[PDB]
């Protein structure tokens, strides 16, 4: 049966892979350009500590990507959007029984102005 497909707040996995790759080597470049010059404010030991922190952060981000690709591997038919469309259909239908009630109530509130008293 027909389900209205929603395009709100989804993204392709290729787009987030591309975004993660450009972000990780942009951060590699940004750590690269700032650590060219060594001063008393930035000793090379602190440079190595910062490099260790950055590679730990990048390892964390790629671990998150690994968990995401495992999660996509859990779904076999790649029909998660079918589930989302079904839930959005449920959101529309649950309100419909409230919508007819509110239609009747609005009908009454428009009806109150139309009598002719004793």
């Amino acid at each position: 049966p027909a389900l209205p497909h929603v395009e709100i707040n989804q993204v392709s996995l290729a787009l987030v892979i591309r975004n993660l790759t450009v972000f990780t080597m942009k951060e590699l470049a940004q750590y690269m350009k700032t650590n060219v010059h060594t001063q008393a404010n930035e000793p090379n030991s602190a440079k190595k500590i910062r490099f260790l922190q950055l590679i730990i952060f990048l390892r964390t981000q790629f671990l998150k990507l690994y968990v995401l690709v495992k999660w996509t591997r859990t779904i076999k038919q790649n029909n998660f959007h079918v589930l989302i469309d079904l839930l959005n259909w449920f959101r529309t239908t649950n309100m419909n029984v409230n919508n007819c009630i509110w239609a009747l109530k609005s009908s009454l509130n428009s009806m109150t102005n139309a009598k002719l008293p004793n």
Binding site: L15, A29, N44, R59, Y66, T74, Q77, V82, L83, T93
Partner: protein, 130 residues
């Protein structure tokens, strides 16, 4: 016989499409998703409860991690904001152009390798412990 208003024998009504009476999991073929995450198997046997963390997902990789990087332990970041950023010739040529304009950030002069060799050569002896 007296006709009654808006009660018309030729007026007919059908069920909703899809019908919520039936199990809509099976109508859209979602039963594979159902029993793979079910807390109890559909034979009277209780199924395994899913873990709170994703430690079982990352259990097959050997690494230095023993805890779970979260938002609240100061190990993760707001990476989803970055991850949700978005911007004749045949389809082969145009897709080559797309993939190669996704390579221009991945090569020097953006990532000069002599500069990185000299800079990470600056690391002195031993690991200072903090």
């Amino acid at each position: 016989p007296s006709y009654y208003y808006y009660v018309d024998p030729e007026t007919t009504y059908t069920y909703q499409q899809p019908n919520p009476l039936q199990d809509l999991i099976s109508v859209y073929g979602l039963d594979d998703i159902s029993r793979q995450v079910a807390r109890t198997n559909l034979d009277g046997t209780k199924a395994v409860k899913l873990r709170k963390s994703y430690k079982n997902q990352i259990a097959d990789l050997s690494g230095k991690f023993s805890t779970i990087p979260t938002r609240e332990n100061g190990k993760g970041g707001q990476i989803a904001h970055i991850l949700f950023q978005n911007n004749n010739m045949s389809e082969q040529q145009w897709r080559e152009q797309l993939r190669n304009r996704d390579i221009a950030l991945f090569q020097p002069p953006n990532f000069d390798w002599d500069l990185c060799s000299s800079v990470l050569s600056q690391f002195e002896r031993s690991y200072p412990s903090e």
